[PDB]
Coordinates of C-alpha atoms and ligand atoms in Angstrom, one line a residue:
Chain A
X1 CA 110.4 196.3 145.9
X2 CA 111.3 198.6 143.0
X3 CA 110.5 196.2 140.2
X4 CA 113.4 197.3 137.4
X5 CA 112.6 196.8 134.4
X6 CA 115.0 196.5 131.3
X7 CA 114.5 196.9 127.8
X8 CA 114.4 195.4 125.6
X9 CA 114.9 192.5 126.3
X10 CA 117.6 190.8 123.6
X11 CA 119.5 193.6 121.1
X12 CA 120.8 193.1 117.8
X13 CA 123.6 194.5 116.0
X14 CA 126.8 194.9 114.2
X15 CA 130.3 196.3 115.4
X16 CA 130.2 199.8 115.2
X17 CA 127.0 200.6 115.7
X18 CA 125.4 202.6 118.6
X19 CA 123.3 200.7 121.5
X20 CA 121.0 202.1 124.0
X21 CA 119.8 200.3 126.8
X22 CA 116.6 201.2 129.4
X23 CA 116.9 200.8 132.5
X24 CA 113.3 202.3 134.1
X25 CA 112.3 202.2 138.0
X26 CA 108.8 201.8 139.8
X27 CA 109.6 204.7 142.2
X28 CA 112.7 206.9 142.4
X29 CA 116.3 205.7 143.1
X30 CA 117.8 209.1 142.7
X31 CA 121.1 208.6 141.7
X32 CA 122.1 205.3 143.1
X33 CA 122.4 203.0 139.6
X34 CA 125.0 200.5 138.2
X35 CA 125.6 199.1 135.4
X36 CA 127.6 196.1 135.0
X37 CA 128.6 193.6 131.9
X38 CA 128.5 189.7 132.3
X39 CA 130.2 187.1 130.2
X40 CA 129.6 183.5 130.3
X41 CA 131.9 182.3 132.9
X42 CA 132.9 185.6 134.5
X43 CA 131.7 187.7 137.1
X44 CA 129.7 190.9 136.8
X45 CA 131.9 193.9 135.8
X46 CA 130.8 197.2 136.9
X47 CA 130.8 200.1 133.8
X48 CA 128.9 203.0 135.1
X49 CA 128.2 204.4 139.0
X50 CA 126.3 206.7 140.1
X51 CA 124.2 206.8 137.3
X52 CA 126.9 208.4 135.0
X53 CA 130.4 207.7 135.8
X54 CA 132.4 205.7 134.3
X55 CA 134.3 203.4 136.5
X56 CA 138.0 203.1 136.9
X57 CA 139.8 201.5 133.3
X58 CA 136.2 201.1 131.1
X59 CA 136.5 202.6 127.9
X60 CA 135.2 206.0 126.7
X61 CA 132.9 204.4 124.3
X62 CA 130.6 203.4 127.6
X63 CA 128.1 206.4 129.5
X64 CA 125.5 206.0 131.6
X65 CA 122.6 208.8 131.5
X66 CA 119.7 209.6 133.7
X67 CA 117.9 209.4 137.3
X68 CA 115.0 209.1 139.7
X69 CA 113.2 206.7 137.5
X70 CA 114.8 206.6 134.1
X71 CA 118.0 205.4 133.2
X72 CA 119.7 205.0 129.8
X73 CA 123.1 203.4 129.1
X74 CA 125.0 204.3 125.4
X75 CA 127.3 202.6 123.9
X76 CA 129.0 205.0 121.2
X77 CA 130.6 201.9 118.8
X78 CA 129.8 198.5 119.5
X79 CA 133.5 197.0 120.0
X80 CA 133.3 193.0 119.1
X81 CA 134.2 192.3 123.2
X82 CA 130.8 194.8 123.9
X83 CA 127.9 191.7 123.2
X84 CA 127.2 190.3 126.5
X85 CA 124.2 191.0 129.1
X86 CA 124.3 194.0 131.1
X87 CA 122.4 194.8 133.7
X88 CA 121.3 197.9 135.9
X89 CA 121.0 197.8 139.5
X90 CA 119.9 200.0 142.3
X91 CA 120.6 200.1 145.9
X92 CA 118.1 196.7 146.6
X93 CA 118.1 195.3 143.1
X94 CA 119.1 193.9 140.3
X95 CA 117.3 194.5 136.6
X96 CA 116.4 191.6 135.0
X97 CA 119.6 191.6 131.7
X98 CA 120.0 193.1 127.7
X99 CA 121.6 190.7 125.9
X100 CA 124.1 191.8 123.4
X101 CA 123.9 189.7 119.8
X102 CA 125.8 190.3 116.7
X103 CA 123.3 190.2 113.9
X104 CA 124.2 188.2 110.9
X105 CA 122.6 187.1 107.5
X106 CA 120.0 184.6 107.9
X107 CA 121.8 181.3 108.2
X108 CA 120.2 177.2 107.8
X109 CA 121.4 174.8 109.8
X110 CA 123.2 171.4 109.2
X111 CA 121.2 168.8 110.6
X112 CA 122.9 165.5 111.9
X113 CA 121.6 162.6 113.5
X114 CA 123.3 160.2 115.4
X115 CA 122.1 156.3 116.4
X116 CA 122.6 155.8 119.9
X117 CA 126.6 153.5 120.6
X118 CA 126.3 150.0 121.1
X119 CA 128.5 150.7 124.7
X120 CA 125.3 152.4 125.9
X121 CA 122.9 150.1 124.4
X122 CA 124.9 147.2 127.0
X123 CA 123.7 150.0 129.5
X124 CA 120.2 149.3 129.1
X125 CA 119.8 153.0 127.7
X126 CA 119.0 153.9 124.0
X127 CA 120.0 158.2 123.4
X128 CA 119.7 159.8 119.8
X129 CA 121.2 162.9 119.4
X130 CA 119.5 165.4 116.4
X131 CA 122.6 168.5 115.7
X132 CA 121.9 171.4 114.7
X133 CA 125.1 173.2 113.6
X134 CA 125.9 176.9 112.6
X135 CA 122.8 178.6 112.4
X136 CA 121.2 182.3 112.6
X137 CA 118.6 183.0 114.5
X138 CA 118.7 181.5 117.2
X139 CA 114.9 180.0 117.3
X140 CA 114.6 176.6 115.8
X141 CA 112.0 174.2 116.5
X142 CA 113.2 170.6 116.6
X143 CA 110.5 167.8 116.6
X144 CA 111.3 163.7 117.3
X145 CA 109.1 161.5 115.3
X146 CA 109.8 157.7 116.6
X147 CA 107.0 155.4 113.7
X148 CA 106.1 159.1 112.1
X149 CA 104.9 159.5 116.2
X150 CA 105.2 162.6 117.8
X151 CA 107.7 162.4 121.0
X152 CA 107.1 164.3 124.2
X153 CA 108.4 164.1 127.3
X154 CA 111.8 162.3 126.8
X155 CA 113.8 165.3 124.9
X156 CA 116.2 167.5 126.2
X157 CA 116.9 170.7 124.0
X158 CA 120.6 172.9 125.0
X159 CA 122.2 175.9 122.8
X160 CA 125.1 176.9 122.4
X161 CA 126.5 180.7 122.6
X162 CA 127.1 183.0 119.8
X163 CA 130.4 181.7 118.2
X164 CA 132.9 184.2 118.0
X165 CA 134.0 183.4 114.8
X166 CA 131.0 182.9 112.5
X167 CA 128.1 184.3 115.0
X168 CA 125.6 181.4 114.5
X169 CA 124.4 179.1 117.4
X170 CA 124.2 175.4 117.3
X171 CA 121.7 173.1 118.7
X172 CA 121.6 169.3 120.9
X173 CA 118.6 167.4 121.4
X174 CA 118.5 164.2 123.2
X175 CA 116.0 161.7 122.9
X176 CA 116.6 159.1 125.0
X177 CA 114.2 155.7 125.6
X178 CA 115.2 151.8 127.3
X179 CA 116.7 149.6 125.3
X180 CA 113.8 147.7 125.3
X181 CA 111.3 150.9 124.1
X182 CA 114.6 151.3 121.3
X183 CA 113.7 148.3 119.7
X184 CA 109.7 148.5 119.8
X185 CA 109.7 151.0 117.0
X186 CA 112.0 150.8 113.5
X187 CA 111.8 154.3 112.2
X188 CA 113.4 156.9 114.3
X189 CA 112.9 160.9 112.8
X190 CA 114.1 164.3 113.4
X191 CA 112.6 167.3 111.9
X192 CA 114.0 170.5 112.2
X193 CA 112.5 173.6 111.9
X194 CA 113.5 176.9 110.7
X195 CA 113.9 180.6 109.1
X196 CA 116.8 179.7 106.8
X197 CA 114.7 176.1 105.7
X198 CA 111.9 176.5 103.3
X199 CA 110.5 173.7 104.1
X200 CA 111.1 171.2 107.4
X201 CA 114.2 169.2 106.7
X202 CA 113.2 165.8 108.3
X203 CA 116.6 163.7 108.6
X204 CA 116.2 160.2 110.0
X205 CA 117.1 156.3 110.5
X206 CA 116.2 153.2 110.9
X207 CA 117.3 150.8 113.5
Chain B
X1 CA 118.2 216.4 200.0
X2 CA 117.4 213.0 198.4
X3 CA 121.2 212.9 196.9
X4 CA 121.0 208.9 197.6
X5 CA 117.9 208.9 195.4
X6 CA 119.9 209.4 192.2
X7 CA 123.6 208.3 193.2
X8 CA 122.3 205.0 194.2
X9 CA 119.6 204.2 191.8
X10 CA 118.9 200.6 191.0
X11 CA 118.2 201.4 187.5
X12 CA 119.6 204.4 185.6
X13 CA 119.0 205.7 182.1
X14 CA 120.7 205.9 178.2
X15 CA 122.3 209.0 177.4
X16 CA 119.6 210.1 174.8
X17 CA 117.1 209.8 177.3
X18 CA 119.1 211.1 180.4
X19 CA 117.2 211.5 183.4
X20 CA 117.0 215.3 185.9
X21 CA 116.2 215.7 189.3
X22 CA 115.4 218.9 190.6
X23 CA 116.0 219.5 194.0
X24 CA 115.4 222.2 196.1
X25 CA 113.8 223.4 199.7
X26 CA 116.3 221.3 201.3
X27 CA 120.3 221.4 202.5
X28 CA 122.8 219.3 201.0
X29 CA 125.5 217.5 202.8
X30 CA 127.9 217.4 199.9
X31 CA 130.7 215.6 201.9
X32 CA 129.0 212.2 201.6
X33 CA 130.0 213.0 198.0
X34 CA 133.9 214.1 198.1
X35 CA 134.9 211.3 200.9
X36 CA 133.9 208.6 199.3
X37 CA 136.2 206.6 197.1
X38 CA 133.8 205.3 194.8
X39 CA 134.0 207.7 192.0
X40 CA 136.5 207.2 189.2
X41 CA 135.8 210.9 188.0
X42 CA 135.2 214.0 190.3
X43 CA 135.8 217.1 188.7
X44 CA 134.0 220.4 189.8
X45 CA 134.1 223.8 187.5
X46 CA 133.6 227.2 188.6
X47 CA 132.9 226.2 192.2
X48 CA 135.3 223.9 195.3
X49 CA 134.1 220.6 196.5
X50 CA 135.2 221.5 200.1
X51 CA 133.9 224.9 199.7
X52 CA 130.3 223.9 198.2
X53 CA 129.0 222.8 202.0
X54 CA 129.0 227.0 203.0
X55 CA 127.3 228.2 200.3
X56 CA 123.6 228.9 199.5
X57 CA 121.7 228.3 195.5
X58 CA 118.1 228.5 194.4
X59 CA 118.0 225.3 192.2
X60 CA 120.3 222.5 191.1
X61 CA 119.8 219.9 189.7
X62 CA 121.1 215.9 189.5
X63 CA 121.0 214.7 185.4
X64 CA 122.0 210.7 185.2
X65 CA 122.5 208.7 182.7
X66 CA 125.3 205.9 181.0
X67 CA 128.1 205.9 179.1
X68 CA 131.1 203.8 178.7
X69 CA 134.4 204.7 179.7
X70 CA 136.2 206.7 177.1
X71 CA 133.0 209.0 177.1
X72 CA 133.0 210.5 179.5
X73 CA 136.4 213.2 178.7
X74 CA 132.7 214.6 176.6
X75 CA 130.9 215.3 179.7
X76 CA 132.9 218.7 180.1
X77 CA 132.9 222.1 178.8
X78 CA 133.8 222.5 175.3
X79 CA 133.7 219.1 174.5
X80 CA 132.8 217.3 171.1
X81 CA 132.2 213.7 170.0
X82 CA 128.4 211.5 169.9
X83 CA 127.8 212.2 173.4
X84 CA 128.3 215.8 173.7
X85 CA 127.0 216.8 170.5
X86 CA 123.4 213.9 170.1
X87 CA 123.1 212.7 173.9
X88 CA 124.4 215.4 176.4
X89 CA 125.7 219.0 176.0
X90 CA 127.2 221.2 178.6
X91 CA 127.5 224.5 178.3
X92 CA 130.9 226.4 178.3
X93 CA 130.5 228.0 181.2
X94 CA 129.3 225.6 183.2
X95 CA 129.3 225.8 187.1
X96 CA 128.7 222.5 188.8
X97 CA 130.2 219.2 189.4
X98 CA 130.6 215.7 187.2
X99 CA 130.7 212.5 188.8
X100 CA 130.9 209.0 187.3
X101 CA 131.8 205.5 188.3
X102 CA 132.5 202.4 187.1
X103 CA 129.3 200.1 186.8
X104 CA 130.6 196.4 184.6
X105 CA 129.1 195.0 187.5
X106 CA 125.6 195.9 187.4
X107 CA 125.2 197.2 183.7
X108 CA 126.9 194.7 181.6
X109 CA 125.0 191.1 180.3
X110 CA 127.0 188.2 179.2
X111 CA 125.8 188.1 175.7
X112 CA 125.5 192.1 175.9
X113 CA 122.9 194.6 177.2
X114 CA 121.4 196.0 174.7
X115 CA 118.9 198.0 177.0
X116 CA 121.2 201.0 177.0
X117 CA 121.6 202.9 174.0
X118 CA 122.8 206.2 172.7
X119 CA 121.9 209.0 169.6
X120 CA 124.5 207.8 166.4
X121 CA 122.8 210.1 164.0
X122 CA 121.5 213.8 163.8
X123 CA 121.6 216.1 161.7
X124 CA 122.3 219.1 164.3
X125 CA 124.2 219.5 167.2
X126 CA 122.1 219.6 170.9
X127 CA 122.3 222.2 172.4
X128 CA 124.0 222.9 176.3
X129 CA 121.3 221.2 178.2
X130 CA 118.9 220.1 175.4
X131 CA 117.3 216.2 175.5
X132 CA 116.2 214.0 171.9
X133 CA 114.8 211.0 172.6
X134 CA 113.1 211.1 168.7
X135 CA 112.9 207.5 167.2
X136 CA 113.2 208.7 163.3
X137 CA 115.0 206.6 160.6
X138 CA 117.7 209.3 160.1
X139 CA 118.0 209.8 156.3
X140 CA 121.3 209.3 155.6
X141 CA 121.0 209.2 151.8
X142 CA 119.7 210.6 148.6
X143 CA 116.3 208.7 149.0
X144 CA 113.1 208.7 151.5
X145 CA 113.4 206.4 154.7
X146 CA 109.7 205.4 154.8
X147 CA 110.5 205.1 158.6
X148 CA 112.0 201.7 157.7
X149 CA 115.3 200.6 158.2
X150 CA 117.5 200.6 155.1
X151 CA 119.6 201.6 152.2
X152 CA 121.2 204.9 154.3
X153 CA 118.2 204.6 156.3
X154 CA 119.6 204.2 159.6
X155 CA 116.9 203.9 163.2
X156 CA 119.1 206.9 164.8
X157 CA 120.1 205.1 168.2
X158 CA 122.7 203.1 168.8
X159 CA 123.1 199.9 171.6
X160 CA 126.1 199.8 173.4
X161 CA 126.6 196.5 173.3
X162 CA 128.2 196.1 177.1
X163 CA 130.2 192.7 177.6
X164 CA 131.6 192.3 181.3
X165 CA 134.8 191.1 179.3
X166 CA 134.5 194.4 177.6
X167 CA 138.1 197.1 178.0
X168 CA 137.6 199.5 180.7
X169 CA 137.1 201.7 177.9
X170 CA 134.1 200.2 176.4
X171 CA 132.5 199.6 180.1
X172 CA 130.2 200.7 181.1
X173 CA 130.0 204.1 183.7
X174 CA 126.6 205.6 185.6
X175 CA 127.4 209.7 185.6
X176 CA 125.7 211.8 187.9
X177 CA 125.8 215.5 186.4
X178 CA 125.3 218.4 189.0
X179 CA 124.2 221.6 188.0
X180 CA 124.5 224.4 191.2
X181 CA 122.1 227.8 189.5
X182 CA 123.3 231.2 190.5
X183 CA 119.7 232.9 189.8
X184 CA 116.4 233.6 196.5
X185 CA 118.6 230.1 197.6
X186 CA 116.3 227.5 198.3
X187 CA 119.9 225.0 199.3
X188 CA 122.1 225.1 200.7
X189 CA 124.7 223.6 202.8
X190 CA 125.0 222.3 207.0
Chain C
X1 CA 141.8 193.7 148.3
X2 CA 139.9 190.1 147.4
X3 CA 136.8 188.3 148.5
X4 CA 137.7 184.5 148.3
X5 CA 135.0 182.3 149.0
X6 CA 134.5 178.5 150.3
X7 CA 134.2 175.5 147.9
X8 CA 131.0 174.3 146.0
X9 CA 128.8 172.3 148.6
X10 CA 125.8 169.7 147.3
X11 CA 123.1 170.3 149.7
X12 CA 119.7 167.9 150.4
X13 CA 116.3 169.6 149.2
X14 CA 115.3 170.9 153.4
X15 CA 119.0 171.4 154.8
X16 CA 120.4 175.0 155.5
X17 CA 123.9 175.9 153.3
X18 CA 127.1 178.4 154.5
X19 CA 128.9 179.7 153.0
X20 CA 131.8 182.0 153.9
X21 CA 133.4 184.9 152.0
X22 CA 136.7 185.9 153.9
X23 CA 138.1 189.3 153.3
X24 CA 141.3 191.2 152.9
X25 CA 141.9 192.7 156.9
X26 CA 140.8 196.5 157.0
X27 CA 137.2 195.1 154.5
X28 CA 134.9 195.4 157.4
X29 CA 136.2 198.9 159.1
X30 CA 135.3 200.6 155.6
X31 CA 133.4 198.0 153.6
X32 CA 129.9 196.1 153.6
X33 CA 129.4 192.6 152.4
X34 CA 126.2 191.7 150.7
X35 CA 125.4 188.7 148.8
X36 CA 124.0 188.3 145.4
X37 CA 123.2 184.8 143.7
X38 CA 122.5 183.6 140.2
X39 CA 120.6 181.2 138.8
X40 CA 121.6 178.9 136.5
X41 CA 121.1 180.8 132.6
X42 CA 119.2 183.3 134.6
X43 CA 119.6 186.7 136.1
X44 CA 121.4 188.3 139.4
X45 CA 119.6 188.7 142.6
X46 CA 120.8 190.8 145.5
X47 CA 119.6 189.2 149.0
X48 CA 120.7 190.7 152.0
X49 CA 124.1 193.1 153.0
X50 CA 125.7 193.4 156.6
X51 CA 127.3 196.5 158.3
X52 CA 130.3 195.4 160.9
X53 CA 130.8 199.0 162.1
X54 CA 127.3 199.1 163.2
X55 CA 125.9 195.7 163.6
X56 CA 122.9 196.4 161.8
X57 CA 122.3 193.9 158.4
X58 CA 119.6 194.0 156.2
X59 CA 117.3 191.3 153.8
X60 CA 115.5 191.5 150.7
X61 CA 112.0 190.3 150.6
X62 CA 111.8 187.5 149.1
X63 CA 114.6 186.0 151.4
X64 CA 113.5 187.5 155.1
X65 CA 112.9 184.5 157.0
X66 CA 115.2 181.9 155.7
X67 CA 118.5 184.4 155.3
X68 CA 121.1 184.5 158.3
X69 CA 124.2 187.1 157.4
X70 CA 126.6 187.5 159.9
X71 CA 130.0 188.7 159.8
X72 CA 133.1 187.6 162.2
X73 CA 135.3 190.6 162.6
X74 CA 138.2 188.6 164.5
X75 CA 138.9 186.4 161.3
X76 CA 137.2 189.2 158.6
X77 CA 135.1 186.8 157.5
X78 CA 131.5 187.6 156.5
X79 CA 129.1 184.5 156.3
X80 CA 125.4 183.3 154.6
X81 CA 123.4 180.5 155.4
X82 CA 120.4 179.6 153.9
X83 CA 117.7 177.9 155.4
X84 CA 115.5 175.6 153.6
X85 CA 117.2 174.4 150.6
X86 CA 115.2 173.6 147.2
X87 CA 115.8 173.2 143.7
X88 CA 115.6 176.9 143.1
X89 CA 117.8 177.9 145.2
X90 CA 120.6 176.2 143.2
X91 CA 122.7 178.9 142.4
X92 CA 126.4 180.7 142.4
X93 CA 126.3 183.1 145.4
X94 CA 129.0 185.7 145.1
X95 CA 130.2 187.9 147.6
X96 CA 130.6 191.5 146.9
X97 CA 131.5 194.7 148.7
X98 CA 130.3 198.2 148.7
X99 CA 132.2 201.2 150.5
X100 CA 131.0 202.6 153.4
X101 CA 132.0 205.6 155.0
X102 CA 133.4 204.8 158.7
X103 CA 132.1 208.5 160.7
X104 CA 128.8 209.1 158.1
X105 CA 128.0 205.8 157.6
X106 CA 127.1 206.8 154.2
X107 CA 127.2 204.2 152.0
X108 CA 127.2 203.4 147.6
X109 CA 124.8 201.6 146.1
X110 CA 127.9 200.0 143.6
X111 CA 130.3 196.7 144.4
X112 CA 133.5 197.5 143.6
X113 CA 135.3 193.3 143.5
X114 CA 133.2 190.9 143.6
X115 CA 134.0 187.2 144.5
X116 CA 135.0 183.8 143.0
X117 CA 131.6 182.5 144.0
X118 CA 130.3 179.5 145.3
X119 CA 128.1 176.8 143.7
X120 CA 125.2 175.2 145.9
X121 CA 123.6 172.3 144.3
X122 CA 120.4 171.6 145.8
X123 CA 119.1 167.6 145.1
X124 CA 118.7 164.8 146.4
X125 CA 121.2 163.2 144.0
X126 CA 124.5 161.7 144.8
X127 CA 127.9 162.3 143.2
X128 CA 128.6 160.0 140.4
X129 CA 131.2 160.4 137.9
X130 CA 130.3 160.5 133.7
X131 CA 130.0 158.1 131.3
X132 CA 130.9 158.8 127.8
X133 CA 129.9 157.4 124.4
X134 CA 130.2 157.8 121.5
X135 CA 128.8 159.3 118.7
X136 CA 130.5 157.7 115.5
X137 CA 130.3 159.5 112.3
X138 CA 128.3 157.9 109.6
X139 CA 126.0 159.4 106.5
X140 CA 124.0 160.4 109.0
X141 CA 127.2 162.4 109.8
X142 CA 127.7 163.9 106.7
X143 CA 129.8 166.8 101.6
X144 CA 133.3 166.9 102.8
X145 CA 132.5 168.0 106.2
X146 CA 132.2 165.0 108.8
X147 CA 130.0 165.2 112.6
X148 CA 131.2 163.3 115.6
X149 CA 131.5 164.0 119.1
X150 CA 130.9 162.3 122.6
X151 CA 127.6 162.1 125.2
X152 CA 128.5 162.7 128.5
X153 CA 125.8 161.1 130.1
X154 CA 124.4 160.7 133.8
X155 CA 126.7 162.5 136.0
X156 CA 126.3 164.8 139.2
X157 CA 127.2 167.2 140.2
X158 CA 128.5 170.2 137.9
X159 CA 130.6 171.1 136.3
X160 CA 132.0 168.8 133.4
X161 CA 134.9 169.8 131.4
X162 CA 135.3 168.2 128.1
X163 CA 138.5 168.8 124.9
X164 CA 139.3 167.2 122.1
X165 CA 143.2 165.3 121.1
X166 CA 144.2 167.1 124.7
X167 CA 143.4 170.1 123.4
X168 CA 145.0 170.1 119.8
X169 CA 141.6 169.6 118.2
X170 CA 139.8 173.2 118.9
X171 CA 138.5 173.9 115.4
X172 CA 135.0 173.3 115.1
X173 CA 134.1 171.7 118.6
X174 CA 130.7 172.6 120.0
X175 CA 130.3 171.4 123.5
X176 CA 126.9 172.1 124.5
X177 CA 125.3 173.5 128.4
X178 CA 124.7 170.2 130.2
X179 CA 120.4 169.7 130.6
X180 CA 119.6 168.3 133.7
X181 CA 117.4 165.0 133.1
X182 CA 114.7 163.8 135.5
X183 CA 116.7 161.8 137.0
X184 CA 118.6 164.4 138.7
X185 CA 121.8 163.7 136.6
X186 CA 122.9 166.0 134.4
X187 CA 123.9 165.2 130.2
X188 CA 126.3 167.3 127.3
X189 CA 127.8 166.5 124.1
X190 CA 130.6 167.7 122.6
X191 CA 130.7 167.3 118.9
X192 CA 133.5 168.6 116.3
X193 CA 133.2 169.0 112.2
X194 CA 135.8 167.6 110.7
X195 CA 137.2 166.9 107.0
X196 CA 135.7 163.5 105.8
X197 CA 139.0 162.4 104.4
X198 CA 140.6 162.7 107.6
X199 CA 137.8 159.9 109.4
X200 CA 140.4 157.1 108.2
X201 CA 143.8 158.8 108.5
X202 CA 143.4 161.1 111.8
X203 CA 142.7 160.2 115.5
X204 CA 139.4 161.6 117.8
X205 CA 139.7 161.7 121.3
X206 CA 137.3 163.3 123.8
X207 CA 138.7 164.1 126.7
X208 CA 136.5 164.2 130.2
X209 CA 137.1 165.3 133.5
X210 CA 134.6 166.0 136.7
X211 CA 136.5 166.9 139.5
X212 CA 134.2 166.4 141.7
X213 CA 134.5 162.7 141.3
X214 CA 138.0 162.6 140.9
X215 CA 136.4 161.2 136.7
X216 CA 139.5 161.3 134.1
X217 CA 137.8 159.2 130.7
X218 CA 138.8 159.8 127.3
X219 CA 137.0 158.3 124.4
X220 CA 137.7 157.7 120.6
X221 CA 135.2 157.9 118.4
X222 CA 135.3 156.1 115.6
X223 CA 133.9 156.0 112.0
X224 CA 131.2 153.3 111.6
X225 CA 130.3 150.6 108.6
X226 CA 127.4 149.6 107.4
Ligands
NAG1 C1 124.9 205.0 198.7 O1 124.9 203.5 199.5 C2 126.0 203.9 200.7 C3 125.7 202.7 201.2 O2 125.1 202.1 201.1 C4 126.4 205.3 201.3 O3 127.3 204.9 202.1 C5 126.0 206.1 200.4 O4 127.0 207.7 200.9 C6 124.5 206.1 199.2 N1 124.9 207.7 199.0 C7 123.9 208.7 199.0 C8 124.5 209.5 198.0 O5 123.5 208.7 199.8

C-alpha cells in the first residue's frame, strides 16, 4: 500500500495568512488526489479533486497543485472557518491529517480544584477534578500529588477544542479513588506546568 | 462430415476462447440441420440453406461458443457490441450460416454458472475471425496495474451469471457458426 | 442523491457487525460504494469499495479476511461486515460513493457524497445511564469569577449531551470530551465560569441527556460552605 505522508502535523497561523499543506506519496498516484476538510462533529467535505480541480461551492481561496508523489494544498488567505483538519486522499488510502489552529499570545491557565461531592462519597467512590481554563499553547502537564506522593494510573485527562472566541484551550483531569482509599490521606494537590507559568502552580485542599 | 461433434457436444467454449473445427475430405448433409426444430436462430448469408446440399467447397469451418440471448444479433456481418468487438467478429463479406439455440437447461446453474466468460475490456476491436485468450489486467486509468486487480484495473474477462430463472435475453445460447471457404473442393453436398 | 446508514450498534468483543447504507434509486448504476471508518480522535481509514455494475469488490490490505462488502441492487442498499471485532474497531463507519462511467467503467478517486456515519462500540460493557455529581464552587474554584460544573460519570455507551439552565447559560461553558475509564464506562465533565456575585442570586442547573439509555437528569450545583 502507498503510504501518504502529510506535513506538517500541526500549523499555527493567523486569519489572513497563507497556509501551505504538503502531501507526499511513496509511489506515483498520477493525478488521483483529493483534499478534504473535516470540522469537529461533521463528516469530511471535499475541497479539491484530481489534484488541482476545485469542487463546486468551494471558495476560490482553496487551491491544489502537484502530480505523482508531491502535492500541495494552498489556502491563499485564511478565514476563521478554515481552522480545522485537512486530509489528502489517494484511490486507496487517506493521509494522516494536518491540523490548522489559530496562533495566539501565550496565556497561563486558571487552575481550579474540586473536592469530591458527598453524593459520590455515598456511592463509595471519590473523584477529584483539576480544571485548567483558557490557556495557550495547548501543551500542559498536570501532576497529581496525594500527601506529597505522586499518583499514577488513577487519573485521566481531556482537552477541549480551540475556542472560537478567545482561541485558547481547557483541560480537565480527574483523579478517582475509592472512598476507603480517599480517607487514608489528607492532602490532595494538583501541580500544573505550562509556558505561561514561571513556576509550577499547585492547587490543594485538605480533606 | 462430423457435424454432430460440434452441435451435440457436452461442453461448449466461452466466447473469448471460441473453438473451431476444420471440416474437410467428407460429404456434408445439411438437411439434418435445416430440418431440425431445435434451433432458435438459422440465418445463412450469401448462400441458400436448401441449395447447400448441392454445392462444393474447399474447406468449411465450424466455430462454437456460448453467449446470452440478446447477443446473438451481434453474431452477424456489420454488427457492433461487446461480443462482436472483443470476442468473436464476423467479416462484412461473410459467406456462411449462423445457428443458435437456447441452452438454459444445460448451461445455467442455481448459484450461477461462473464458468462461461466474455471479454469486457480491450484496447482495440477484434479483426474478423480473430481470437484473444489473454488474461492481462486492463488499465482503465492512468496508474499501472502491475498484474493486480484494483482501482480502474480490471481483469479483462467478465463471467456470465447464468441462472435458470433469468430472462430469455440473459439466458445462455449455444451458437455454431458455419463458414464455407470459396477458395480444389474437399467438402460437398450429397 | 442521499446516503442513509443504519443506527449505532454495541457489539461484544469477538462478534461480527453488519452496517447498512441505503442509497437513492439509480445510484448503483453510476456509482461505487466505499466504506471509511474513523476511530475517536483519529483519522480516516479506507476499508474497501464495491462496484455493483460489475459484481466486483476490493478490500484494503489491513482489512482483507475480516471485511465483506455487498450490494443489494433490489433494495439499493450496500452492506459492510466486520468479522472479529475488538477495541480498535470501535469507530464511526461511513459509507461514501464515487462516480463511475457506466460504459467505460472508469471510476473517480474522490468521494462526492458521505453518509451520516454509524458508531460501532466494541466492548463487553452493558448500557448504563450516567451518574451526575456536582462540582460545587468555592474558594478553591475562585477574583470575581467562580468555577462550577457537573461530573457525568460511569455511562455507556457514547454519546451524551450536556446543557446549562436548559440552554439559557451558554457563555463560559466548557464541556470536555469524554474519557474511557478502566471499568469500560465513560466519564464526562462540563464546567462553567460565572461571576462570584451571582453565586447567591443565580441558580445553576446542568441538564444531561443519554439517549442510548433514555436517561434525562438535571442537577442543581449549589455553593459550598466552610
Ligand atoms: C444430435 O442428436 C439428435 C438426437 O440424438 C439428432 O437428431 C441430431 O441429428 C444430432 N445432431 C447432429 C448435428 O447430428
